[PDB]
Design a binder for these strands. Structure first.
Ligand SMILES: *C(=O)[C@H](CCSC)NC=O
Lengths: 271, 46
RNA sequence: CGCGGGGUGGAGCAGCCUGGUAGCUCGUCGGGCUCAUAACCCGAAGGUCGUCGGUUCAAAUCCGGCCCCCGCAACCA
RNA sequence: CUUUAAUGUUUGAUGUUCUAACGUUGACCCGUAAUCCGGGUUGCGGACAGUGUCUGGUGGGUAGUUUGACUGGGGCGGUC
RNA sequence: AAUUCCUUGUCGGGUAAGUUCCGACCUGCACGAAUGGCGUAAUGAUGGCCAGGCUGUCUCCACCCGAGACUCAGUGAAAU
RNA sequence: GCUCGCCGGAAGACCAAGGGUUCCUGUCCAACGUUAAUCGGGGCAGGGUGAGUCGACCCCUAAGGCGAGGCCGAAAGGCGUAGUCGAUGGGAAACAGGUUAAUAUUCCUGUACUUGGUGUUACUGCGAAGGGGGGACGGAGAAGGCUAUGUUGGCCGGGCGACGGUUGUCCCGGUUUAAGCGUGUAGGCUGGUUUUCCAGGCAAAUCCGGAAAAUCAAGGCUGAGGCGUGAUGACGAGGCACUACGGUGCUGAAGCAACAAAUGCCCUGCUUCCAGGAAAAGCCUCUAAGCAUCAGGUAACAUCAAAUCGUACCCCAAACCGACACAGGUGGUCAGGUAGAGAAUACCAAGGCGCUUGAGAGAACUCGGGUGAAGGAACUAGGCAAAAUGGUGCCGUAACUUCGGGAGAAGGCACGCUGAUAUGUAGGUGAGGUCCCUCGCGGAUGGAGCUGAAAUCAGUCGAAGAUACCAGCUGGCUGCAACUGUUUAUUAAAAACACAGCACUGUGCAAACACGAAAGUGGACGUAUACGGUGUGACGCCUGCCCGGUGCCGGAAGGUUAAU
RNA sequence: AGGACCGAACCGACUAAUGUCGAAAAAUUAGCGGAUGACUUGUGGCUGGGGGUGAAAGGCCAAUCAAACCGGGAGAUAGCU
RNA sequence: GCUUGAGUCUCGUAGAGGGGGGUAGAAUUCCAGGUGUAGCGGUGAAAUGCGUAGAGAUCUGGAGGAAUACCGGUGGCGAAGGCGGCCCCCUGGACGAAGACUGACGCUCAGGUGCGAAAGCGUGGGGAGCAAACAGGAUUAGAUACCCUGGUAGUCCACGCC
C-alpha cells in the first residue's frame, strides 16, 4: 500500500512510503546470495568514470533465473521476497523435482500460484513461452534479444511490452518507451506486467533517503569554476554558453544514436 | 593539529621497501642510481 | 570636456549616403451620404527643411559655428 | 545538327536473395575443477558493420601565440 | 527593494529628536515568471530594527586578590 | 620522615601503533637539562626480555595488488584467467598464588586443557582440487534473568582513646578465592523418529531438497549464572622475631548473610522497521575415479612432540608525531565512595605527582579575575564584552499553521532540617514454615528480615533553602534560504554548495557516456517505474508574448562542393 | 519512529580576549553548534601532474597548488636592476 | 387482537438502472508504399496554411484513440445528477397474478450521513477527433470578437477532491 507518513519532523514531512504486507520478512536463501562490493563508479584503472556513485548501503546480490531453461516442470510460488538491486520484487518458486530458484514477480501473483515454462504452459501471468506461441496483442516482460541469452527488455516495476505482429521469423514489439523493435522469433518472454506496481509514486523526503541508496550530491555546472566545467565562474551568476555536458557535447537535444548494426532491427524510434 | 607524518612500518615498507622497487623497472633505476652514488641506506629495511 | 545621431506642413515619420525634383498616414478646410454625428466616399490646400555663414551653375542634402533633444561616457587609486 | 529506337558494349547507381569473408559481450562441447581465451559445432546478422589511407565539415575539448605606439600617468577619444 | 544614481524621494508609525527599520505611494536611472515569480509553518553559531530584563559598556572610575613589570643571585637570546 | 597542596572517566593502571635499551644497579659531573645539581630518560661499566595454551608465524579468504599461458600495445608495459598473495576478519588449547634491583597467564607450587605422530587392543568400509550443512552476520528498541562490583549487618582481631562525653545503636582494619570437571537451571530455537519414491544439486550419493502415508506428541539443539568441586590448599589483618635498620625468616583468626546494581553476559537472542545487512577454510556429512587378508576411519589406552620470532620500558607522553625535556595531535580496555539523571560537576580512595629557575617588592602599565554609591546603553559602527536567566514537580501558555508544531512559549507556585501518618508508608527482593509433585537449581503459599520514593500535617532555623559547582536570556516586526547537513586546513560558515521534488533531454543494450592510443572495464551482473547530462530547488498559488540572431532537431529537390 | 529535542564523550570551529621574535609555523582560556546520523574514527588498499579529487572554494593533493616535489635540458632568457 | 396502511415469500415481466471485464464495424488521423498531377483548402470575398522535395484525389496495408449512425419514439429506467453497439459476470429497483403469513413494524424530519452534470484541482497513464489560452490572416473607424488556418491545458482512463 501507499502511506504518506505523519509530519513528525521536517525531512519526514514529505516522505511517502511503499508498505508491502506480502514480502517475506525473514532472511533469504543463502546458496543464491553472492557478494557484491560497490565500486563508486571506478574502472579498472581506478578513476571515476561515472559520477554520483558510491556510499550506499552494504547489499548482497540475489542470483535469479532469466532463462527458464528447465522446461516441462511445473512450479509453486512458495513466497515473495524483497530485492535491493531490482525495482520489482522477486519470488522464490519451487520446481516439482525439488529445486528452488528465483524468478521475477509478475503483477497479479499470489504465494501458491502455478507457473511453468516451455511450450505447453498455458496463457497465464508468469508462464514463459517462445513468441511463436504467443497471441498478438499480449502484454509480456523479460523479452530476450537472442534465444537463450536470458531476457533483457521490460524488467523493472510494471514495465510491459505489447507485441505488435509476427510476420515470418520477425515478431514485432512495442517497447515501454515507444520504439518498435523487430526481434528473433524464438525470443522467450514472460506473460503479464512486472510487479511492484506502486514504485513510481514513492518519494524520498530526505537527502539521506537517497544517499544510502547509492547516489552522491549532484553539483550544478554553473557553480563550478570555468576550469572545471564548460559553464560557471563569472562575478554574479552568469551563463549564456550553449548547454553542454562536462566534455563539450551539446546536451538538451543532440542525438548520439550510432551503433548502425542494430539499425536493421529498429523500425520506429521514440517520437 | 595533526602533524603531517604518522609512522607505520607495514605501510612504509609496502611503498618504499626493497621489493617495493624491484617490482618495477623504475625501481631498478633507483636502486641503480643510489648504488651509483655510493649510498648506504638504499631503502628503509633491516 | 568627449562620441554618435536627430530637428522638415498641426502631429508622427520618409527624402540626404550617390546635390538641380519634397512623399506618406492622421488631422484641418469644402462638398456629398444621414433626420443629425461619427465612420465612409470624392476634392483641394498647407513646410522659413531649427538658426547662420560658406563652398557650388544649384544645398533639406556637404563642411564648420550656435541652441534644443536622446543615448553613451564621465574611469583605476 | 537534334530528336529517338533496338542491340552490342562500358562501367556506374538502387532493391532483393544467397554464403563462404567477417562480427557474434547467442546456446553447447573440449583443451580444464578455469564466468578470460583458443578451437570445433550450430543459429542469427552479413558483404553491411567495423578497422586502415585519403577527404570536406564541425570543433576553446585541448594546445602554441597575437592582442601597436604617441599620450603633459595610464584609460576613453583623437592621431600616425 | 540584497534591485532607486538623483534621494535621507513623499506620506504615515515608532523616538523628545530616526540617512537605519515597519507599512504604503509608482515618478520601476536600470524588477519580473525555472539564469523561476510572489507568499510560507518550522529551523538558522545568519542579516536589519525596537521593547523588557540586566549589568562598570558609559557618565567617571576607585579599591581589592593573584601573574609579570622593579630589585637581588644564576643562566642568557632577537630583528637592526 | 612529618604536615600542607593538586588530578582522580585523570596528571591512574595495562595492550596495539611507533620508538629502540630510553628499564634496573654501581660509579662519575667537563658537556646535555633554559639555574645550582652529590640528581636524572646525561657519560661510563655490568645486569635484565625464559611460553605447546598471549600475540606474530601458520590454514582461510575481502577490498585490492602480482599474475603461467592469453588478449592488446611503437618499446617499456597495460588488462586479466587458472593460481598466489593480502588483516583491520574467521580458526585448537591455562587459571590462581608466590618470586627478582629489573621479566612473568613465560620461572617455581598446585591443579588442568588442545592438536597431531607412533604403537597396542576390540570393532569397522574408507576414500577427492566434487556436492551438502555449518561457519554466517543490519540498525534501532524493550523486558526479564544474573554477574562484575559497592554499601550495610553479623562474625573475628585491635582500641575504650594527648580539651569536655565515649564498655556502647561505639570506633578502626578484614571478611578475597579462578580456570578446569560435574549438573544443565532461567530462558531461546524447532514438531521428532520411520518406510518408500525422484527429470534437482555441471557425475554419483545412504547427504540436503521435493512429493505421499505411518506413529507419537515430545525429542533434540543451545544455554549466562548459581550451587557443589577445585580448596583439612593458597592468601590473609595482626603478631612472633632478626635488622646490612633496605627488608627477611616464621606464624597466622574470621573468611558468611542481605540488599542495590551495570553500557559486561544470556543476546552470533526477542519484537519491529527498512536503506535489506563479508567470503573462505577449520568442523561435520555424502559419495566418484579407485583400493579392499590390507590400508585407513572410530573408541579406549601407553608414550613422544608442539619448533621459530616478539616478550624489558614508554604507550592521553621529558622516550610516539610536532627541530626542543614543546600549554599541541594520538586508536582500544579497566574505571571505586557521597551528592547527582549522568562517564557532568564538587570533594575523596587505589595510585601518581607539586608542573626544572627561586628570593624580596607590593609603582605606573598589562594580563587573569572579585566587588561597587546613583543612573541604567546616556557607550558604541553594533548591547561586542561582561551582567544575568539557568533544576524538578505542578498550574498555565498567543499570533500563525503544512494542524506535527509555535512551546521549555511567555508567566508563576512549593523546595532546607525534624517529628507524625508509619518505634520508616506505597512499592521491590524475599528466608524460615506448610502442603504438593511428572523429585528438582521445581510450583503454589507464606510472610520476618532487608530496602525504600513521594505526599500530607505540624514544629523550627537563617537576610537568603533548585543555598556551592553544574545550569536557557525572553519577546515583537522583518530580509534571505525550506529545513538536517557541507565548504575557503592557516584571516570569509554565509543569502554560497548540497538537498528531497519538478522539468527538459540523451539512452532499445556490444546502451548513451567516461577512463584507456588498444584490449578491457565502470555504467550494471542494472536494462525505459532504468540510467547519464542539464537547469531549478520543500510545500502552496502559478509558470504570459517572441523562432528574428545563435544553437538544436526535421527535410531533402536544387545550387555550391573534397579526395577519387 | 525520528537526517527529532536537551546535553558530556567525540567531532567541529561562531564571538571575544591572550598571543604575534607565542607554549604552539592557527593554539590556549571563557563561552558556542552537531551529538542515531549525509555520524565519527582505527587498520589496510585504490585514484597522480595538464592528472587526480572535489555537498565546488579555482579549495585539496606531505606546513607548498590559477597546474605538486626531485633530477635533467640549463650557465634557459632579461632591450631590466 | 383484526384488517383495508406497510412489509416478506412462491412464479414471471419489460427495461440506456448500475459496477467490473472482453469484443466489433463505419468514419477520422497518421505512417510506409503504388498510381499520377498542378493546384488543394476555405470564405461574403480573401488571405493565412499546404504544394512541383511532389499535396489533394484514388487504391492497399498497418498503428492508436474516442464516440456508438439507421434501430430511436413528448419511448423506457433511476431519487436525482444522469444512462443507450453487441456480449459475459456481479447486482439494484419497480410492476403484474392467485393466495398465504406477520399484525400498525407507520407519515415526516432541524442537526447528522450519503449520492450528486460540467467546469476546475492532485497523482500517474492516454492523446485520434474536438478544442480554452495563445499566434497568425482578414473583415473593421478600432476587433485583444462573430468568420478562416493552426493549437496547449482540457475533454478520455483508475484512485481521490471539489
Ligand atoms: C587603492 O585604494 C589601494 C589598493 C591597495 S590593495 C593592497 N589602497 C590604498 O590605500
Amino acid at each position: 500500500a501507499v502511506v504518506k507518513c505523519k509530519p513528525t519532523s521536517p525531512g519526514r514531512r514529505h516522505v511517502v512510503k511503499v508498505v508491502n504486507p506480502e514480502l517475506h520478512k525473514g532472511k533469504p536463501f543463502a546458496p543464491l546470495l553472492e557478494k557484491n562490493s560497490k565500486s563508486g563508479g571506478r574502472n579498472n584503472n581506478g578513476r571515476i568514470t561515472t559520477r554520483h556513485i558510491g556510499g550506499g548501503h552494504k547489499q548482497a546480490y540475489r542470483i535469479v533465473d532469466f532463462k527458464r531453461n528447465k522446461d516441462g516442470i511445473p512450479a509453486v510460488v512458495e513466497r515473495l521476497e524483497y530485492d535491493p538491486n531490482r525495482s520489482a520484487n522477486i519470488a522464490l518458486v519451487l520446481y516439482k523435482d525439488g529445486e528452488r530458484r528465483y524468478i521475477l514477480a509478475p503483477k497479479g501473483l499470489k504465494a501458491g500460484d502455478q507457473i511453468q515454462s516451455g511450450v505447453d504452459a498455458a496463457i497465464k501471468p508468469g508462464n514463459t513461452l517462445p513468441m511463436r506461441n504467443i497471441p498478438v496483442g499480449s502484454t509480456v516482460h523479460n523479452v530476450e534479444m537472442k534465444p537463450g541469452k536470458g531476457g533483457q527488455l521490460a524488467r523493472s516495476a510494471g514495465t510491459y511490452v505489447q507485441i505488435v505482429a509476427r510476420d515470418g521469423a520477425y515478431v514485432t514489439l512495442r517497447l515501454r518507451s515507444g520504439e518498435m523493435r523487430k526481434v528473433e522469433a524464438d525470443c522467450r518472454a514472460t506473460l503479464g506486467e512486472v510487479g511492484n506496481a506502486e514504485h513510481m509514486l514513492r518519494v524520498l523526503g530526505k537527502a539521506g533517503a537517497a544517499r544510502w541508496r547509492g547516489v552522491r550530491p549532484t553539483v550544478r555546472g554553473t557553480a563550478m569554476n570555468p576550469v572545471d566545467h564548460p559553464h560557471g565562474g563569472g562575478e554574479g551568476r552568469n551563463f549564456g554558453k550553449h548547454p553542454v555536458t562536462p566534455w563539450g557535447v551539446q546536451t538538451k537535444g543532440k542525438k548520439t544514436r550510432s551503433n548502425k548494426r542494430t539499425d536493421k532491427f529498429i523500425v520506429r524510434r521514440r517520437s | 593539529m595533526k602533524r603531517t607524518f604518522q609512522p607505520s612500518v607495514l605501510k612504509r615498507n609496502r611503498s618504499h621497501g626493497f621489493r617495493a622497487r624491484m617490482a618495477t623497472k623504475n625501481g631498478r633505476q633507483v636502486l641503480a642510481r643510489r648504488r651509483a652514488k655510493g649510498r648506504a641506506r638504499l631503502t628503509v629495511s633491516k
